[PDB]
Amino acid sequence: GVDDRDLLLAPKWISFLSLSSFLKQKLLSLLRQIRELRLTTTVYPPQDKLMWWSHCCDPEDIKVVILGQDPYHKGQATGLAFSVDPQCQVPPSLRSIFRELEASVPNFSTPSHGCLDSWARQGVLLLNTVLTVEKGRAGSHEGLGWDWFTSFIISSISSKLEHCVFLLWGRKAIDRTPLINAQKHLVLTAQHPSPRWPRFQGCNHFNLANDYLTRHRRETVDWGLL
């Protein structure tokens, strides 16, 4: 009943997630609502980038899941959490991320661009918990219906893979904790990187992720490859 291409997800992710006909409908209805909203408002990112994160990663090659809130809201959003097009300045959140890598990861030097696609090809999944935002208004799609979808993805990665690392940054990312199997994975939590939980400055998530990865005979992430 559902043309799987209307789901926008790469097909490796369709089979991995193996959404029921019901959940595919639920997703299609949300996608339709977003389209209708685009007639009155500007929504970021473009419709064709909402699932960009599925096109960069085969789901089995995931090593690290990084989870954000909602997309950048002033043009910068690419479809990958925290990443920016080369047309745009590195926003405060990514500058702060780089500052932590600069301070913590040997030979990391801060790039003049904010493109995180290199992390994606090394098996870092850069996921927002809410995949859209109205231009200008931060958090403005918070209760529109993305949450079941991103929660479903996090659960499936946790159930289907072994020994991934999840870096959960800020309250909404951290809410997904109960979905991740404590006997198989590592979760590291911090306060959100933009200026209750541990401070982001000093969290050392990047070296800790790699420590865990190397320990499970998996290949590290080269965070400085950008």
Numbering used by the authors: 19 to 213, 223 to 253
Copy text verbatim from the article accompanying this structure deposition.
Efficient γ-herpesvirus lytic phase replication requires a virally encoded UNG-type uracil-DNA glycosylase as a structural element of the viral replisome. Uniquely, γ-herpesvirus UNGs carry a seven or eight residue insertion of variable sequence in the otherwise highly conserved minor-groove DNA binding loop. The UNG leucine loop is a conserved structural feature which is responsible for widening the DNA minor groove and flipping pyrimidines out of the base stack and, in the case of uracil, into the UNG active site for catalysis. kUNG, in common with other known UNGs, comprises a single C-terminal globular domain made up of a four-stranded parallel β-sheet flanked by six α-helices, with an additional left-handed coil of three helices at the N-terminus.
The structure of kUNG in its apo form was solved in two different crystal forms. The disc-shaped structure of the leucine loop extension centred on the side chain of Q212 was not observed in the two unbound kUNG structures. Taken together, the unbound kUNG structures suggest that the leucine loop extension is highly flexible in solution. However, the absence of electron density for the leucine loop insertion in the apo kUNG C2 crystal form, and partial ordering of the leucine loop along with significant crystal contacts in the P21 crystal form indicate that the leucine loop is very likely highly mobile in solution. Mutagenesis suggests a model in which the kUNG loop is pinned outside the DNA-binding cleft until DNA docking promotes rigid structuring of the loop and duplex nucleotide flipping, a novel observation for UNGs.
